[PDB]
Amino acid sequence: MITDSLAVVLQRRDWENPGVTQLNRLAAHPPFASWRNSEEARTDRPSQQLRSLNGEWRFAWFPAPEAVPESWLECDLPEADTVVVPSNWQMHGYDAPIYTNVTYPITVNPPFVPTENPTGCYSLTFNVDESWLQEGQTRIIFDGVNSAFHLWCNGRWVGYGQDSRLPSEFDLSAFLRAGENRLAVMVLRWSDGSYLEDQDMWRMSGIFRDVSLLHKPTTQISDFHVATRFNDDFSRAVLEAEVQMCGELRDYLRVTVSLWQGETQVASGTAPFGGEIIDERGGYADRVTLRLNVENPKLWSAEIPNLYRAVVELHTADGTLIEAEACDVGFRVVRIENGLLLLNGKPLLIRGVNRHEHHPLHGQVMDEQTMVQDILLMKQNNFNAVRCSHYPNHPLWYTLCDRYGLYVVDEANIETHGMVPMNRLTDDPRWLPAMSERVTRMVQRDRNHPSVIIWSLGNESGHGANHDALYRWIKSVDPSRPVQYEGGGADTTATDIICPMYARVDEDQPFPAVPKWSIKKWLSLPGETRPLILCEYAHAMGNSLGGFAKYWQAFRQYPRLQGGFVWDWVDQSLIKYDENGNPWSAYGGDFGDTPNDRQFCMNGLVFADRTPHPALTEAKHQQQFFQFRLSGQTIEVTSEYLFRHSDNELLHWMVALDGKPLASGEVPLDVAPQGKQLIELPELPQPESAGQLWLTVRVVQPNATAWSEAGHISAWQQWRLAENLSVTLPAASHAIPHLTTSEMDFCIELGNKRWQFNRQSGFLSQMWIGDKKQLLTPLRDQFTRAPLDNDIGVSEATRIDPNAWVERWKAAGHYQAEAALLQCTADTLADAVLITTAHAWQHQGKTLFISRKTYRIDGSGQMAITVDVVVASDTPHPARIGLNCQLAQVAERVNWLGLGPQENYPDRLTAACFDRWDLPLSDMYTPYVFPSENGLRCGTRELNYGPHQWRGDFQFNISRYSQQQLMETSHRHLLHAEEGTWLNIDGFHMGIGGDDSWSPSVSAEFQLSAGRYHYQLVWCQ
Amino acid sequence: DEANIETHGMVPMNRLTDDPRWLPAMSERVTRMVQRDRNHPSVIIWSLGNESGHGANHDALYRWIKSVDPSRPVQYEGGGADTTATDIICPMYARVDEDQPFPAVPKWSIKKWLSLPGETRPLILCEYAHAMGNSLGGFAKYWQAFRQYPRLQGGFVWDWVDQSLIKYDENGNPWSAYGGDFGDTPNDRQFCMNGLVFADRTPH
Amino acid sequence: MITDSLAVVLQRRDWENPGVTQLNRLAAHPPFASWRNSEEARTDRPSQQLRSLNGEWRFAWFPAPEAVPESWLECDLPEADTVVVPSNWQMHGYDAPIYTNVTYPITVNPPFVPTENPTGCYSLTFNVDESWLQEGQTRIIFDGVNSAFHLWCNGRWVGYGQDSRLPSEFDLSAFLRAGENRLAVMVLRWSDGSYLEDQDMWRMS
Ligand SMILES: OC[C@H]1O[C@@H](SCCc2ccccc2)[C@H](O)[C@@H](O)[C@H]1O
Ligand SMILES: OC[C@H]1O[C@@H](SCCc2ccccc2)[C@H](O)[C@@H](O)[C@H]1O
């Protein structure tokens, strides 16, 4: 067999030819199991005709396709290892995974790939029983192979495939023999299809989804479509089922479509083959259309995922079953009328998130347990929609979104971000066959899923004529779903929905030829009528989602702003091992990949092991389905559910005075969809004790659901009630602190306590309790923070981005400005000691900051610090204005009265509640993989740590890591706990931003721009 | 200018053109025509082909042409001459006053067709007045209607020249042959000769 | 050259695969003449860089692609006649032209064509001056070939084409040698493209 050899098969070079995307590959279709029993098809029991080939395969790695020896087609190589399939081979140490965002990981010369094309040679030896070979068709299904592959069965060449994210099927019935069979798969890392697969993710390769064998009869169901059509009030539905057969037509062949609600049968129909006349030549003799009438169907939504079970039986006229197929059916209609995306007649508000298929140990191989873990965490955090970014997912994902209830945007595997210009391939008709396959085979696979409500043409591919053609193709074959597409400025003719990426709420971004308007402006542009759903917004890179409440204020206010998809769900960090076998989270660059985009792979709301970032609580609160308004004693509760009554909800309210509770109660919620309920509170307590009174309400789900435990909190809100200002005089103690002045220091002693102020630096250098020194570093002003990912942007040491906040802070010298003592005085009062200092921060003769402090140690041992800071108006605005010190104490728990429990920032504090919080010190540090400023708690009135107590109204963070160490360390596993405890206490702190992470995104009301700042602290014990 | 797509023989007529596995083959035939001929001023209308039913591949290729070349209308007859893949209602052999109510692809009369509810496009007959032999009776009825109605903008007579071939009998005398005269079987006999002129371009 | 042989090129059977409509064919474009003088381009005088290959070619008819001998790729067959190109071979008495309106002239089984697929083997021997080979690109333009064809230049496989009514262009600059060149074109009567070419006319090739 010369034509089966590697020298002949590889000479054509099908992976460098966009005109050849497949050879001998079967047609795309919904997932089949080929049940030969209709009751087994109804109850979804596993079919004996669908056989999984997952498990241990033989694997050999090669640097090029030409390096594979000819003997591999007949027998296993001696150097072949045994790997588990599905896997990526970069996760088993054969070459390195590459992380790159925009730049292609190969030389851009389409359609050519490098000759150094890493090649994975898979082989499997397996037995086929002889009953499969006597009759029928046996196909092999590769659910996903990255990137391209040739297939051999028993040394004979079967076919070729591309499009890594959709299933490739090949007929093997002329290739298999009885008994022992060998199956050789040669997987290439790069192909012509890699130019269409430039998604921002780790570039891996291999057989990364399931491999299976399917045995079908000779006359078989080749395709089936379900479509639901409704009347005006959704009380009568028509399930239109279109079944296609292949094989030889017989007049005794029948098709029965039965519809089941659990165990009871709702509708049924039967028909012989032969469609209606559609043109001059007749109709389809090999197709049927069955129309089933359903009276009062239970409608599918993400709130209530009502599913039916449709069973399609191919059988003869006397009644013997040939084949059964089945799919879950949800009755739902998605349409855009009058500029609004409607589901079942109601306007959606998309609480969405982008989700890559990522596992930190297995790369891009997804199992069911991680998918179920993601869906539960999404619904417990008030998400109702997922965008498949940016490729079709594993087929089980759509089934689980049908079952639990999530809207799905299904997206074609087309991204050519790296091209210059971005539409170089998508405006070329020579690439229209390759692009069409990626769209048409997605729609043919996934059109029956009720959770898929929107088709997407891909991501970031410019706007070419191939998008307009593929837009119109989908609208022809599937009118039941809108089509969206972002590229070319988000409002082209190839989209039903304006879908911008990272457009801001109020700020325009006038880029040439693709401007990102503000989303409020974008709706009102002349001639613009479509709804706006952000396909990516609120870039969650590290310590981010500042200003997330501004989006959700705008989403609720404007009807045609129907929400969006947060970028993104999970960090794409991988696991490496250092030297002791200790795992650590790796990002781009850590595998020797070059060039790479470093930490832009980690943008998740959860870590790669699915533990939450603190920004997930902010997303949960802003996306909550109950809105609250307080007016006196009355709470109105507005439901934002569209379809369900609040039948698993009770409102729990509490009133507390500076953290200690005074009154509480529980009210059951009975609120209609989009309705209101007035909750009259009782006569709330009116304590004459000083302090702010706080009302907190919570919506608790008493019963467990499919996706939540009992007692799940789904919504909350807090308000300030009446305040009593403290007019009580301090207790006049009779002791007096004693001031001692040397030429080195001022020394103030009172009882066992002692304070020392260095007269050359001007700072409080040491404090004593008895004979224990309390400080390791003096109490100094701090105007900087360890920069966030939003502060850094796309700036690195080679390419400075001069607009980024960290580059403006470095160029202004904020990180290296030195304090210069201007004056220092110490005075004894009638009841206190008064220390007054003044410092200037200068960089190259330019005074950046001036801080004037006042230390007042009274007879009670309290030290009242008042700080007045002047900031030069021409320097960039400082990241913080506050104090830091390194305490000598390492206590185990941190106690504070303020906003919490989780870390919060001035533009990310709406989810935090004011209460008395008590956490261990390890919970006060957020372990971001790229270390930065973290752990801040805002709105704090009291902080307790060890013997110390601080009072005022301040922001703090408290950790074992200095801001200097967090700035200079690239990974969190390289952080070492310092001696003692670093405390930062800020009067004022800049917002964190997070509209995007590559331009300055901190809005002007969260910048420290006032020029003069004042704050007060009381240090005591 | 008309793309080289006709699948008249298929049952049903859109069996290939509603199949996305044939969309790469159909797109090449359309996109390479437009890339060759878009600079000619005499080309005023693109045509997606002839007699291929109406599938989703026509709608995609319609929208492709409107994107790359907005300067020319696109017409397409298949699927009943008034589908979403045509800018112009272009029926084949629709009569002036008589309806032909075929199931799912009716040929209305051209006066009725313009006035159907929601219909706004112009009507240009892509084939009319079939000139097979001694024919073109009632040709004046079309041209009375073309001049009377503004949205009836004429049409294309089928067709210009007879497709007869030359054979030689026994003395070397040439004679005009039609379908069947070469041993071809099955064939459609004299339906190849529909011209207004003979094959040597002398007039009927 | 095993991969240039007829046993390897024809084993793929590109004419029964609607996913393969061309191999190594250049992009479509408006008609070019490549004038090296702008006044000659303005007055539409004939370009010396556009060379017609019309004229007398060698032709051999075969009932099937499998019946073509391997020696045809290197030298002319002894039974080869001399035909004028452009022509249809049914007008020269090699098989019959078929007239059919609606019914396909083959069995309707897409994308498969009959194994009795009449095959016309064209060949041309021609001289290229060395100035074309020193610099630049030399392409061959087939303005129309009914129905599908494989192309060889000097025994090396160049490419494949379908769509009988539009031009097929192939880069030959890595295939031509100085002096005498041979160009072998194997034209098939039926292909997968014939299912898209069911116009009411004489079916020729
Ligand atoms: O999937 C869409 C993507 O868009 C790009 S914008 C390009 C800005 C950029 C370029 C190069 C390196 C880093 C950022 C974002 O960086 C990604 O995080 C993701 O949102
Ligand atoms: O190019 C479009 C063609 O349409 C067909 S209709 C089909 C009627 C028919 C069928 C079979 C044999 C004869 C006539 C005409 O016969 C042709 O002359 C030409 O107008």
Ligand SMILES: [Mg+2]
């Ligand atoms: Mg290819």
Ligand SMILES: [Mg+2]
């Ligand atoms: Mg991208």
Ligand SMILES: [Mg+2]
């Ligand atoms: Mg082909």
Ligand SMILES: [Mg+2]
């Ligand atoms: Mg016809």
Ligand code: NA
């Ligand atoms: Na809204």
Ligand code: NA
């Ligand atoms: Na990213």
Ligand code: NA
């Ligand atoms: Na008129």
Ligand code: NA
């Ligand atoms: Na005719």
